[PDB]
Design a protein around this nucleic acid. Structure first.
Lengths: 280, 93, 93, 280, 241, 241
DNA sequence: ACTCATGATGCACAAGTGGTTGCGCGTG
DNA sequence: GCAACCACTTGTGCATCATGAGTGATGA
């Protein structure tokens, strides 16, 4: 029997058939009449949560408990994208009742040979012009960092924007420079999208391959593939384009959503998550 | 994805808020959203059993000359088939 | 052809009957029709200059990641873009 | 300014982008609140006139002067499809301002050589295999007559229905045979559609090539191309599939509309009309 | 060789056996079908299906017009399904010689601005109604070409400086501030058109321009229901009240 | 090796500097964020953004639950975003030897129908809350497999015959005719979960199953803000009314 | 502290009903 | 005669407010 607020997985759009993200700030997420209602001071906005994968929470969002229950049931993940990086994640039950992807990921991460093979595949996806038949884990990480910094430098000289010889990380990345805010907004949008996709597919976010130690390691392992390809150039373009008085976060989020739509980042992400785990 | 429009009135507040999770609400009672056949069918089935004693009407893309078809459940304005062309009929008291 | 939905209230009966010539009426003030872009813009221009003092909301298919866009004129439920994504905003008293 | 009840040709769909026809009987077409309304006894139906090319009027039908004006302004043509074929035609001002098509048709119909050549093109489109490059008026007319009789006979044999050696002609063709009623319904729909298209394009219905003498000669000429291709086989299929105590006209019209949609008869009709006048 | 152009307004038309039944407020009229040549259906008219079928069986042209034919809205088939006028017009307009000859014959026979424009629009409506009744094509014009209503303009140019101008001048003289000049112009034009002499002259000029022989020409009869009751009674037109 | 499980309900959590603020009807409770451990946000909770910012800054596992953890609704990161339990569970479930060993360890450790069903669902909710707090994945199950919560089923199988059965029998004995039994079963199960000993048993069993060394194991302390204020006053928990 | 359900009370808008005015839509 | 306009009543159902009832959506 259909009950308002509770829906089966089939009544919900697939992961690749829904929108990307919504950013909410200075509001009060609430559930009235079984509708996820954002109670902004001026008025109320009801979210079509079934069409959205992840929901971003900015500064001042007082979210209730039935709102989180409804969002988790819908499949929309919750991420608290505050200032200077992502502060907290949240996710309900997975949209998939089968754990073939999860068990395959566990098998691949429990084995050192499979771990190195998956790391090689990730590196090949990020940089397909190299040969990685004889690289090691530490070498892979060093090369990954080296050409991530190189791509940062290339985009810094391309768009004529100062950069203080740094690489973005969700942990303690802050600054008054608009480039810092643009990078933070684009990257938190990407991380929230990756977290929502991983949660919906049933994958465990803590069974990472390149990154280990924290329960969001796989989120980093899937987000870094598209970090330098789309989100970093988008943030640099936003920093170049942004003028005085422009909200860097809002414009950066708009541009990164435009690039996510244009690049088909989420369908590509699902295809990648299928290819790395090697399901025929 | 073909467009789907659902109009509601005299229905429980639970359904009126529940449909806003799938399609938005441009005006009181009318909801618009882009789905496929399966999602739209499941959502119409949900509307059928939650509307209770109300009126519900659905518009969606179809394969006729006009290009759309209507489904109504205990709605005032029924649909009469004028030889494969769906038109809205308004009965008189 | 994309499906266009126009919702009207507090508008002259002339517009209520006139807009039915192009696009049907499935509920009181709720209209549905399939037009191309140019026909839809012309019809919306007709709606703008005929409703006088009233509420008009039009929903059409677009190229955002939701799949639709809203254009409203003197309507209660204004539309606010949530970083390139259209959402319905219902102001309070 | 924009006035309710009036619309320019640009605000109207193209002739080939509209629905074909709609049939109305035992009703009262009326204009209330600037809308074409069909006031049945038990209720009222508003006609989407701007999406319908021709309107069919059946027995016991009352139409108001303002309703006729509204339908003509909208571009929908009026045809009184009673029993025993089409009883009357009606149309308003055309929605094609330029008269290039009409002038070309007049020039083509004034010259006897041009008439013979355009009749050759129509016979070629109706029957492409045969070669008629050296035929005259009587030879042609007799040849299409014989081909139509042969098509009628073979289609009757295909569906195994009795045919009393007849050919449809709106000049006093009456019958109570269910096959006769079905083919009459299909043919009246076809003639109404042809009249609507000819009026919409600006062509004069009186400037015919094969038929001549009556004001609708061009309508018959254009309907010759399509009457044997689709309408006759669909009418025969309706007659064969009919069951006892069934409204033959309703199902015949439904199948005629389905055939028109499947065969793209409207875009095909406008393309053939453009090619007939040799308009590049 | 006789065509009666009966104008119906504020009435319903239905068929009983073979005669249409006008149901105006003044009374009920029973014109036979054969008597009617062209029915100029006017405002406030509910023409029935049976009446349309009967009129189309007897080759009657149903033209939906305004008050006294000021505006043309829609029309049916021609008078007795006649194409000879249309064929002759097409032949005379196709080649250059006949076009020039007919145009030369045209010129040989040939607030204030608002009234003038309204009068021209009403004249266009009446010309279009007459043309649709006779069966000519408004596109095939001699002086004017390139418009779907060119021949109507050409025929109305015959009466442009003889009918519309005096009516517009009278309206402009009898006018005041705050009055809709177009309304007065249209009302005065229909007042001028109710007489019927203008329509007879229009039909005769149509055949004259078409170079139709005088033997084969058809004379117009702008009949009336109650204004010409004494003329309609001997021809079998019943009158009720 | 301390992991406090502060269960919140009927409150609104906001952050004062390095201190959350639970504002129930009883009063305002201020807790140092460094001691939160696991937060079980129950119904009627309005968790603020600054509060979750501060809680995630200190590795707090926020799990949105119902009445004393009857149902699991959502969860955040784990205790100190740890992966040791998750990685250990994955390693033990992947290869056949350790999976069989863990299954054997589980076996060694281990109206009426409606009451049982409600009790099982409540136990599933509590087990899922504990698992999502610690960091384990609910899908990687040993005895059960292929489902999103197979591990939750496998863990609840330990307490099937010693928690849910007595509560269901008590509900069936106390059940009245014409009353819903699932409601009473869920209420009695949450009443049993009030004390917190069951949560301690679940944490201990979860840490024992994965062969976590006893030296490195952390124990569960299901604090209560108002019932256990004596144990919280010297730890820095201010109280207001 | 939340959300839902519910009984009030207020209300804004559509529906039918009764006359009244006009035949309308205005470039070549 | 038809159809728009306007005024007047009738009435339906949405939106609001205050109170009491729950913490719910239920599979090895």
């Amino acid at each position: 029997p259909i009950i308002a607020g509770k829906s089966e997985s089939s009544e919900l759009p697939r992961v690749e058939d829904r929108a990307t993200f919504i950013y909410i700030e200075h509001a009060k997420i609430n559930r009235v009449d079984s509708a996820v209602t954002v109670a902004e001071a001026k008025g109320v906005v009801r979210i079509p949560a079934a069409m959205i994968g992840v929901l971003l929470l900015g500064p001042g969002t007082d979210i209730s408990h039935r709102a989180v229950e409804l969002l988790g049931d819908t499949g929309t993940a919750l991420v608290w994208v505050g200032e200077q990086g992502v502060r907290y994640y949240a996710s309900g039950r997975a949209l998939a009742r089968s754990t073939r992807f999860l068990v395959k990921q566990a098998e691949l991460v429990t084995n050192e040979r499979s771990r190195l093979r998956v790391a090689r595949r990730m590196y090949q996806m990020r940089f397909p012009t190299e040969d990685v038949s004889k690289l090691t884990m530490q070498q892979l990480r060093s090369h990954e960092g080296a050409r991530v910094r190189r791509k940062y430098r290339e985009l810094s000289k391309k768009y004529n924007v100062p950069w203080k010889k740094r690489v973005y990380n969700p942990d303690d990345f802050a600054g008054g420079d608009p480039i810092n805010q643009a990078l933070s907004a684009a990257h938190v949008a990407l991380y929230g999208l990756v977290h929502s996709v991983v949660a919906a597919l049933g994958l465990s976010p803590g069974l990472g391959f390149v990154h280990t130690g924290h329960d969001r390691s796989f989120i980093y392992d899937v987000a870094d593939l598209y970090k330098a390809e789309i989100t970093v150039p988008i943030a640099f373009a936003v920093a170049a384009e942004a003028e005085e008085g422009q909200d860097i976060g809002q414009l950066a989020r708009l541009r990164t959503r435009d690039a996510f739509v244009d690049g088909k980042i989420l369908k590509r992400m699902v295809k990648d998550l299928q290819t790395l785990l090697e399901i025929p | 994805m073909p467009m789907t429009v659902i109009t509601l009135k005299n229905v429980p507040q639970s359904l009126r808020g529940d449909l806003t999770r799938w399609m938005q609400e441009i005006a009181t009672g009318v909801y618009v959203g882009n789905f496929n056949s399966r999602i739209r069918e499941y959502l119409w089935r949900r509307v059928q059993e939650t509307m209770g004693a109300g009126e519900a009407s659905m518009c969606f893309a179809a394969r006729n000359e006009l290009g759309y078809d209507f489904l109504t459940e205990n709605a005032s304005r029924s649909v009469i088939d004028y030889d494969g062309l769906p038109l809205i009929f308004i009965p008189k008291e």
